[PDB]
Amino acid sequence: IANRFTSNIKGLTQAARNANDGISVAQTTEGALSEINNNLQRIRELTVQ
Amino acid sequence: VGANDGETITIDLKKIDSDTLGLNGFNVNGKGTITNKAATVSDLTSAG
Amino acid sequence: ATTGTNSDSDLDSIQDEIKSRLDEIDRVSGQTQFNGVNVLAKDGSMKIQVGANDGETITIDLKKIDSDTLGLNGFNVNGKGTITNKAATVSDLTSAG
Amino acid sequence: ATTGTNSDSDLDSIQDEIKSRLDEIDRVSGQTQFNGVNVLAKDGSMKIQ
Amino acid sequence: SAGSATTNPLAALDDAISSIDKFRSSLGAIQNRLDSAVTNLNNTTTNLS
Amino acid sequence: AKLNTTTGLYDLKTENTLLTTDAAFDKLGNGDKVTVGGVDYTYNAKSGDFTTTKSTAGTGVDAAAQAADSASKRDALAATLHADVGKSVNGSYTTKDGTVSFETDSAGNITIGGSQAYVDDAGNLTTNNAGSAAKADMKALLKAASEGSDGASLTFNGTEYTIAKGITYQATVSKDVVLSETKAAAATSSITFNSGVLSKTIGFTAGESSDAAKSYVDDKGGITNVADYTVSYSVNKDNGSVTVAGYASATDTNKDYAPAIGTAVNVNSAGKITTETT
Amino acid sequence: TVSFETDSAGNITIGGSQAYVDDAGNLTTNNAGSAAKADMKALLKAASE
Amino acid sequence: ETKAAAATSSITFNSGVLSKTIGFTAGESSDAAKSYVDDKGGITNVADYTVSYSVNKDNGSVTVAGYASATDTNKDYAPAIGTAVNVNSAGKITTETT
C-alpha cells in the first residue's frame, strides 16, 4: 500500500505540473487573440470612416 | 491530469487567419484580387 | 445568465462555461481514487474493524455523486424556454387529414 | 511524457532516460549474485535443511 | 408549447448543493466518531498493558 | 445408483434432455438458417432477429391460374401497408437506367417536389400527363411496374423492394415470433448451425428432435450425441471405498465422457459424485 | 409542369441528371421501355406528334 | 503418404457437434468443393471475390462501389458500397482508417 501511495503521489505531482503548462499555453494563445481583436476593431472603425 | 491512463483534458485550437474569417478581397476602394479557382474535368466538360 | 438583457451569443458563452464546469464535476467524481477504490463512483459502504473480536465494525456510507444523481443533465440554460406556437391554417389543416 | 504539450525532442529525451533505467533493471537482475548463484536469473527453488 | 430550457435552474442547483452538504456532514460525523474510537482504543491498550 | 445383481457392481445412470427450441435459439449464431412451414429465415445477431426474403406471389404454371390473382392481391396489400396516413415518407424509384425521387404523404399519393406526379404504362414517372394517363396512386404505380417490360428498384425508409422483369423484398420478424410458430404445433421446423466452416442441420418437431438424432443438452449445455449416461461403481467390501470400474453408453460416446478406471469416488460439497479430490 | 435545364448543343437535364422524353410526350428523368431519346429536338418532335 | 501418392483421402473436421468431410487428391481437394483457406485461415469455401472501385475524376477520390462473387458467399467479404477506401501502413488497399 505504501508503494501504491508513492506511485499515486508522484503521478499527481507530475500531473499538476502538466496542468500548469497547459495554463501557460492557454494564456499565450489568448494574448495573441487579444491583439488580433484590437486589429479587427481598428479595421472596422476604418471601414465606418 | 490524473495519475492513471485516459485522464486527460483536451484544448481545442482554431486556425485563425484571413482565409477562415473571409475578408480576403475586402476591397473597400474596389481594387484587389480573388485568386479565383482551379479547374476540373467537370468544368472542362461543361465548357465543352 | 437568467437576465433578459443578455443576447444569444452571451447566453451561448455562459452555457459553454457551465458545460465545462459540469464536465469538471463529472471528471473529478470519476477519477477520485483511494487505494484503487473509486470512492465517489459507487453507492456502497465500507467496513472498518475497530475491535479485537469479530463484529466490532464501523460502516462508512458512500454515495454516487455525479451529474446523473444531481440532475443537471440537459442544463440547457441557453435554450429557448416557453415559446408561443403559430396559429393553424387551412394548408396544414388539410395536411393533417 | 504522456502530456500532449511535449514535442518530439522532449519525447526522445524522456524515452532515452526510460531506456537507460530499463537497462539498469536488466543489469541488476543479471548481475545480482549470492555465493555464485544468480538469484534473480532463474525461476527455480532452493531447499534448506 | 413548452421549450427545452431548464425550468428551475436555481432550485435544481440548490438541491444539488444540499445533497453535497448532507453527504459531507455524514462524512464529518463518521470521522469524529472514528477519532473517538481511536482514543478509546489507546486508553484500553494502555490499561491492558 | 442401482445394484446390478448379476455382476455385483453399482451402476449410476444419468438421463439427458432432448434438444429444445429455447436451447436451440440460445445457441443460434450469425448466419443460421431456420426452416419452419416451408419458409427460410436467416438469424441476425447484430439486430437479433430473423430476416426473410418474400416474393409477391405466383403459384400457378399458366396464365389462367391463381398466380395472377395472388400477385394482384399482394400488390394491393403492399400498397395498403404503404398508407402511412399520419406522416409523410420519402423514397426513390429507379428504372433500368434512371432514377427519380419520391415523397408520399398519405394513401399512397405520389408527390414530386410539391407537385403531384403520374405513372405511365411502362411504369415511367412523369410530372406531366399525355392522354390523361394520370392514375397517380401507389396501386397503379405498382401495377404498371409489374406489367412493365423492364424491372425497377424502390428504396424506402425500410427495406428495398425489387420489381422483377413479382416483387422480391426483405422483411424482419422477431425471434420470439418465430419461436411461437415453431413451438405452436407439430411443425417440421429445422435449424442449421453453421460456424462458417462446420455445419449441421437438426430437424425437431415441436421441441424434441424426432429425426432419429441424439441431440441433448443436460451435460454442460450445448449439444451432445450421448443418449444415456451410465457408469459402474465397485464398492470394496473390506475398505468400504467406491471406485469407478468402467462405464457403458447406448451410443458410442467416443470415450469422450470416459472417467479413469480405479479412481476413488468422492462426494462434492454440494453432495454430488465427483472424482476431484479438492 | 416540368422545369428543365437545357444544355449546350441541345440537351435535357432535370435536377442535375439527364432527362428523357416519353413517346407520348411527357418528360421524365428515368427511361422506361428502352425509349430515352434525350434530345430537345426529340422532345419537340414528340410534342408535335 | 497422402501428399506423395495420387490417392483419394478424406479428412473430417469435428467440433464435437458440427462435422464436415472433405475429399483430397494428391495435395489438393478434388471433391467438387471450394475449400479455400488463403484469406486469413479457416476453410471459407469461396472461389473468388471481385471488388469494384469507383474513381471520382473531379478530385481523384476512390470509393467502394460493387461486389461480385462466383459463389453465394453470404456477402461475407462484401464491404458496404459508398465507403471511402484508404491505404494501410503496409501499402495494402483497406477500408478502415485506424
Author numbering:
A (entry chain N): 50 to 98
B (entry chain N): 148 to 195
C (entry chain h): 99 to 195
D (entry chain e): 99 to 147
E (entry chain h): 489 to 537
F (entry chain F): 196 to 360, 376 to 488
G (entry chain p): 294 to 342
H (entry chain e): 391 to 488
What does the paper say about this structure?
The rotating flagellar filament primarily functions as a propeller, acting as an Archimedean screw, and supercoiling of the filament is essential as rotations of a straight filament do not generate thrust.
This long-range Sn:Sn + 27 dimer results in an observable 8-start helix on the surface of the sheathed filament in addition to a 3-start. Residues N319 and N323 in the EHEC H7 flagellin were chosen for mutagenesis. Two double mutants were constructed: N319F N323F (FF) and N319R N323R (RR) and mutant flagellar filaments isolated.
